[PDB]
Subunit: 147 residues, 2 copies
């Protein structure tokens, strides 16, 4: 069974949040766990704050472009920073719910990539292909509960 | 070189950021490899998608809270709509970074470095997180600069 020959993928961003939560002493659960209302309100506040910052940075970029400015790659840095902050609190929320963000994201990706294989309307709107199946997030969460 | 012995199945799943890049190739929108200033149309598009998903996330959180205020005990299954919208929010957040030609994992890792470092600081008596000795802020400009070269 176990011998000296007995014996690991690089961490994902969702895993980084699990590690952060350990570091801040938050003890977040391994499996999906209904939160107290205080936790939901905290998560909402964090989402609102970062969404607002992203929105403000896009607004600032659009304003400069409206003035006739070409933006540089460096001009993108505040927006990139706030988008990454938004990932952090979005992953943060899933991690505090005990829900494996990568498992859920894979399911959403599956349905989105599948939809991308459909044709487009003449106006450019994406249509679904025949046999398309919606993201089954309820099924994902049920699977995560048993292991 | 690869040979007839090569294992084609890679040892590790693609990252969420890499998935977005694949998604954008699928929709006929193959996006740049390096940070690329966008036209205003693209920024307007990304903003609308962030507003839509963030409004859906908020609605699912409100709905859970309403149920709790009524005295209901939520189950794990009740979390699925919120999980779904949180994942859609990641999708359009990564989506924006990929459309900008900016490697999301590189930016995220720098933000993570600063946040994890802050987590190693002491707590003020009221529970507020303080920074440790030696703390250095996330340097996202340095990250974007590096990605251009
Ligand atoms: Gd921020
Ligand atoms: Gd959505």
């Amino acid at each position: 069974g176990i011998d000296p020959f007995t014996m690991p993928c690089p961490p994902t961003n969702a895993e980084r949040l699990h590690e952060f939560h350990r570091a801040i002493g938050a003890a977040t659960p391994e499996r999906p766990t209904p939160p107290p209302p205080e936790l939901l309100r905290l998560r909402q506040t964090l989402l609102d704050e970062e969404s607002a910052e992203v929105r403000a940075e896009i607004d600032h970029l659009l304003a400069r472009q409206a003035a006739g400015e070409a933006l540089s790659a460096g001009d993108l840095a505040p927006l990139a920073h706030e988008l990454a902050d938004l990932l952090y609190v979005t992953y943060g929320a899933l991690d505090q719910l005990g829900i494996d963000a990568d498992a859920v994201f894979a399911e959403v990706h599956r349905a989105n990539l599948s939809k991308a294989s459909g044709p487009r309307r003449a106006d450019g709107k994406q249509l679904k292909p025949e046999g398309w199946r919606p993201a089954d997030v309820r099924g994902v969460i049920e699977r995560l509960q048993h292991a």
